[PDB]
Design a protein around this ligand. Structure first.
Ligand SMILES: *[C@@H]1O[C@H](CO[C@@H]2O[C@@H](C)[C@@H](O)[C@@H](O)[C@@H]2O)[C@@H](O[C@@H]2O[C@H](CO)[C@@H](O)[C@H](O)[C@H]2NC(C)=O)[C@H](O)[C@H]1NC(C)=O
Lengths: 230, 215
């Protein structure tokens, strides 16, 4: 069959440019356009551009004009995407795709630009951020009220980079009612998330609640006891 | 300028039900250039249908595409758990390809209003220069929910971020966290911090609030 292999994850400063590679494994090289599709976090698929290698038939999305460049290295059988002037709007997963078509195509020498994509690369993650490695600061989310005998508490894990961070409660002994939300990139280029848990409000003065925050890229481990403020 | 729209935003189905997803084109287009893709969570998208109705290889018979002119549909019969995900239509004619916004297919259950909680900034954060206020919407359904922040009855915009859990495997519900980011100076200048939540399971919007300084 036909397979697509892409380069590894990238972290780029705002205003810089990124280059992604896509190396097809199988089939021909100049018959079918390679079409790049990206996906920003929590958004739909967005077509970036496509190019028939060597033959040089290509188009760029209007949003990416004066900013994008698609090209290939014929000897190495590799195609490339270049996106300049990166902003946070360019953060996401970049897929190279193409139509399998006639595989080896012994009966066709034409080139084809207009096709769906049944072959998809694994995706290349691109993080646009002007931030270096930094450990999180863990703040408590204190419970207090007079919700049907059930209270919520948690930990706000803020201002770290890069992903990921792992969160557990009472060294993993407390799992029911735990919601650890997906991290979000804030305007500063640092990640932030919260982890909440619902507990019986009658046991707030008796049970000890600690969240375990471990950030391997920063070699940071924090344990924050969440008490009701009074 | 061909723009694809899709409906519904979220399609909720039970195992074995039938669902119909709609894609709408800006103008008349040929069915030769319409495709449907499936994306499961964390996985790469996959081609289901090309040329509006031609089922891709390996795709089960449960998926069928139809349509012409400006209205195209994808029908899923006998829905199975592997079919949960986001379905997107694509136009690949002409020079500039385009995708629809996608439709989410999730597990159906009865309506559940969220339990709403609001958390003030901790003192340990205030001594750092910033103030985060957190609003939690716990175990609700359907997915659609609105959160509005209000500081001394002034509506906030541009200074909040929200994230949502995946649909829980046990109770098929969602949870949502909304985080209001304020400077210490702006936080100390106001008293009433309110989170106003709008959801189908609520007869009217619910407002949780606290006063800075336990007032
Ligand atoms: C957009 O297309 C519709 C439908 O056209 C039909 O379906 C197409 C796939 C193609 O096969 C056409 O040849 C078909 O006629 C148009 O609606 C038709 O309009 C004509 C007027 O020329 C009328 O005689 C037909 O009865 C209409 N069809 C129906 C079902 O009512 C529509 O006009 C097209 N849009 C524009 C702006 O022309």
């Amino acid at each position: 069959q036909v397979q697509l292999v892409q380069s590894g994850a990238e972290v780029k400063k705002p205003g810089s440019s990124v280059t992604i590679s896509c190396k097809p494994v199988g089939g021909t090289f100049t018959n079918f356009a390679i079409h790049w599709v990206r996906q920003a976090p929590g958004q739909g698929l967005e077509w970036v551009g496509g190019r028939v290698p060597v033959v040089g038939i290509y188009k760029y999305g209007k949003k990416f004009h004066d900013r994008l460049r698609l090209y290939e290295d014929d000897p190495m059988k590799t195609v490339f995407l270049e996106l300049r002037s990166l902003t946070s709007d360019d953060t996401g997963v970049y897929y190279c795709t193409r139509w399998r078509g006639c595989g080896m195509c012994p009966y066709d020498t034409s080139s084809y630009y207009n096709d769906a994509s049944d072959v998809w690369g694994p995706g290349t993650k691109v993080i646009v951020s002007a931030a270096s490695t930094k450990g999180p600061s863990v703040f408590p989310l204190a419970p207090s009220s007079k919700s049907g005998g059930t209270a919520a508490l948690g930990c706000l894990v803020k201002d770290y980079f890069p992903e990921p961070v792992t969160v557990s409660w009472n060294s993993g002994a407390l799992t029911s009612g735990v919601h650890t939300f997906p991290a979000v990139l804030q305007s500063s280029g640092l990640y932030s998330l919260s982890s909440v848990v619902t507990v019986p409000s009658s046991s707030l003065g008796t049970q000890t609640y600690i969240c375990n925050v471990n950030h391997k890229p920063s070699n940071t481990k924090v344990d924050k006891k969440v008490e009701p403020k009074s | 300028e061909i723009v694809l729209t899709q409906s519904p935003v979220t399609l909720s189905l039970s195992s074995g039900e039938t669902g119909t997803l709609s894609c709408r084109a800006s103008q008349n287009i040929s069915s030769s250039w319409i495709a449907w893709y499936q994306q499961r969570r964390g996985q790469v998208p996959r081609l289901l249908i090309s040329a509006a109705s031609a089922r891709a290889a390996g795709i089960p018979d449960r998926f069928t595409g139809r349509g012409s002119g400006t209205d195209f549909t994808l029908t899923i019969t006998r829905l199975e758990p592997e079919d949960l995900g986001v379905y997107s239509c694509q136009y690949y004619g002409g020079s500039f390809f385009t995708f629809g916004p996608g439709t989410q297919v999730d597990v159906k259950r009865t309506v559940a209003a969220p339990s709403v909680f609001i958390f003030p900034p901790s003192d340990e954060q205030l001594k750092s220069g910033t103030a985060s206020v957190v609003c939690l919407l716990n175990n609700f359904y359907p997915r659609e929910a609105k959160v509005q922040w209000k500081v001394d009855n002034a509506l906030q915009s541009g200074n909040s971020q929200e994230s949502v859990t995946e649909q829980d495997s046990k109770d098929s519900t969602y949870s949502l966290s909304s985080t209001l980011t304020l400077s210490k100076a702006d936080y100390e200048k106001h008293k009433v911090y309110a989170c106003e939540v709008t959801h189908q399971g609520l007869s009217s919007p619910v407002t949780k609030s606290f006063n800075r300084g336990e007032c």
